[PDB]
Amino acid sequence: HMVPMDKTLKEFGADVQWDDYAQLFTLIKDGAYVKVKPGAQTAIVNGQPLALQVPVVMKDNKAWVSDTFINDVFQSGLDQTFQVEKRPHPLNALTADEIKQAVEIVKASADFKPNTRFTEISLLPPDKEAVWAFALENKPVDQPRKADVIMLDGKHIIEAVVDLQNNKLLSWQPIKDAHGMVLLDDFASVQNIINNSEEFAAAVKKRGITDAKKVITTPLTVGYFDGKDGLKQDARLLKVISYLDVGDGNYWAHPIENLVAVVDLEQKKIVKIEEGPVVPVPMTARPFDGRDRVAPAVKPMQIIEPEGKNYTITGDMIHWRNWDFHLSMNSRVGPMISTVTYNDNGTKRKVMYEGSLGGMIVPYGDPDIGWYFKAYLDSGDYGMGTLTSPIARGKDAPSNAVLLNETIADYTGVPMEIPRAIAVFERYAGPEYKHQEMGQPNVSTERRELVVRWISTVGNYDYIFDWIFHENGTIGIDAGATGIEAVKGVKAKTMHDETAKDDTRYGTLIDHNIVGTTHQHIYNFRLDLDVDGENNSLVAMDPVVKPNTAGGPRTSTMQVNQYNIGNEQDAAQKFDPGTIRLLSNPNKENRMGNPVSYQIIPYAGGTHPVAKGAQFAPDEWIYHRLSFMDKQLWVTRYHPGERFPEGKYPNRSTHDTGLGQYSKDNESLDNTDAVVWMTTGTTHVARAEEWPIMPTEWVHTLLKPWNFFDETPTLGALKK
Template identity: 35%
Template sequence: ESGNYDARSVGHLRGDLRPIEITQPEGPSFTVSGNVIEWQRWRLHAHIDVVEGLVISDVSYHDGGRKRPIMHRAGISEMVVPYGDTSDDFYFRNVFDAGEYSLGKTVGSLSLGCDCLGEIRYLDAVLADESGTPHTVTNAICLHEEDYGILWKHWDFRYVQQAEVRRSRRLVVSSIHTIGNYEYGFFWYFYLDGTIQFEAKLTGIVQTRAVAPGERPAYGTLVAPQLDAPNHQHLFNMRLDMEVDGPRNTVVEVDAIGLPMGPDNPYGNAIVARRTEITNERDGRRMCDPLTARTWKITNPGVRNRLGEPVAYKLVPFVGPTLLAAPESDLARRAEFARAHLWVTRYSPDEQHAAGDYPNQHPGDGIGQWIEQERDLVDTDVVLWHTFGTSHLPRPEDWPIMPCDYVGFALKPVGFFDRNPSLDVPPPSGHGTSNCHAVPRESGRAGE
């Protein structure tokens, strides 16, 4: 049967989707100078790196007359897509999409109304081909603002009988990369409350192979008659060169722990934050723990907030799988970065790619070897390497083209600000408190 998915091949299309128009009559709230973007109190630089693809750097926040650095540079240091089928035509498929394929070379030109919607600005990418000849990819990076629902709200029904509500908005910096059969959309979001978020959107065509009539695949899913889509993984590693109020930082692992009953906890309800300082690279390999809501704080011990605590941002990780290949396999040696959710290292200019600079030319290199140096991680220039992704067990609904799947993480301020930095966001335009919240009438008791 046909696996074509263009509009003509599909046939009758639904006709009840009415237009959505997004307009900003006064233009967007951000400005662009070269590759430097300023929006609200954010300032950052965006470009396409030939290996890492979309890179965000020099991220800072203007706070009370101070330009406060947060992140020096962030980019996908490596990503691997290992297939879990043992057949001769699939066992060797484990492409390192950054180190072998070069993510930046796969970036595409974006189109208004198709890839980006709203009041759009674009940045071009200038890249070199295999002969060193420069060429320009137009509209490689998309910039726009999005409404993101409620930022904060409270109806004070006890005293003043009014509501205060603010709308959330985010700046979006994005690019889309076509790597063989898959598309990867990389989206950075910057919020009014100081949050930074990264999201990867996975779409495109699942890899398939033909099987005999009546055969049930052992390592995949039938997505159409006699068409097997093998199980596989998409594992990204984001290199986060942090700079929280300066380059001298310390990483602290934080777990939410329920304490046992005892003299200090007679009702058994006590919850504490257990903090573990990561002081040396020998302890820099960490795993997620959803049961303790584990996060990692990047603190600056030399800068304190008004409550006397070190200023910090925390990495809220994507709680997903790590590499499923056997530890003794060739793949596991070459993709050791994918065997842990987080690695913490001391900054070195020679350490940029988690699987080494040339992953197709060595049996194993990169971050697993770097941490053997056991460098000190206290009050110094630290780099976090976060592995996240998905184990893709294909569905028939992923054929003939896959709807977007989403993975990512967030960076949130923790005592970086003295209080909610979005208090000065104005109310929704043209709406007073009486418009935003209709006070409900008190319901009467039954029979009254």
């Protein structure tokens, strides 16, 4: 019963290290750190001995293992990283069984139409309160599991609710005027449609394209210009931008400028072709995969935890130090962090009921035909959860990460398993604290952070989201941006060319005939923080320079002007990093009679210029439709139905259905259930260093405990 170890392990996804000197094999895979000596009747798993009936065999310089090796060793039980959940958590995402079950319920529905698509199949949230009672009192929820089924019947949106427990269809509801998000088959349609269009073919041949089979299209939302674009609000449309495939594995580097096709997805036809001046396609091969590069040798570097991880994953609940939280996946927004508690000397304190991406937008600034309408709502319009990019083990996440698989429903209602969907990893983050008192023994502690990382790629854009749990109570939310730049074909080769000036009015000349058009990356996070309870108040603390009225030589002082933010409209604001914004529990105080709070920091830095607001005049539509892009901070009363900053059905939206609507009522934020919305972004002005591929650029956000604790949270257990 034997197999060549090296192949089997690689294929298994285990890292295999052979030590000639020590005559030892080191195998690493997620929480499992294994040591095995050829011929040995014992293997070490996370520092624990494991008897092998069939030893590893070295034959003719090749290692061989039993057909049972991987299972016996990896799934030995010595790897305690993953545990079995006894009592299922109320927020566990729909299982593949439940997905199939939900699809069969609506399919067996009277009104179900064949060819209906599933934009989203998600767990319908149990009552927030029953869920907290479950997490804190382990009180069973006791309301049937329900699933939300959102379908696209051609261009129409219907909303169904299925009672899974009972296998019952609870509601069927047509949603008038709403457009559905772009589904994967849309991509294939656009390309086919362009391929079959005779006129298109003609437009491309007059633009110097010899092989019209070499044209690569991209499916783009058209937005809404109040008909100004000349597009019927009624039609299910997509704009089409095309590139030429020159085989360098980078079509994005070969734009066919000033050629736009409008596709009626309902009609499966090209309803309009916008042609502008002819710009020769930049033809030079610009591979980013290294196919033309010399691969330099670097010395090995590995981060190891030879005895296993400090965290435990039981079902979807992650336990690490004083942190407890539930981790699930949504096809639209991706990762969802729930029932986040902080174990304070045996008392689990509520920090966040649920936290997740709210939505995002990538608006362009070029008014030309191939650009003016670009303002991507990649989660809303494209489904970021669905588009998750599997973690490239060790490059995308450090070598000591644990990679989780996540299951979602595809647009057809068939369960889909995303491999290495989320990376979980503990990391050294410098000294937690230090004090080297003169002529005294040093006092230093190392800082440890638990990172939850997720990557989603939409078109040319690659997004990385890190949910960072600081051992001291702080929570960081970082977002990195990489991928390939959306570029404009231009005549200028250099800034010395006559068209250079006009060519670069809207972006930098990053290569010969290539302009990296300016745009912004705007991210919004939806954080339902419950600071040591549900009832919270928004408080402002503005550090000010006030005149010295107390005497002495000082002409001024540093004081703070503190005040509550009473309702939603006042809560919706720009964030001055020089100021302090707390979410406090007016009902609970720390040892000093100070209200337990969390400090909200929407702007904690970045590596690209900061997006001060949306870089759109206020008379602009995009600007209108989407208010979330302009304020950095928003606070709203908790509504189980208000989850998207851009609104639920942003495709060709005619008005603010997102944050503009949620606060529109200007309700009270006094001693009530608040939801924090943090907006952060970059203004991306290009440079040659970002072509052919872009270096990840990061933006940081932070949530810090503020009088939440009574002292340094990391000091340690008192022996007193």
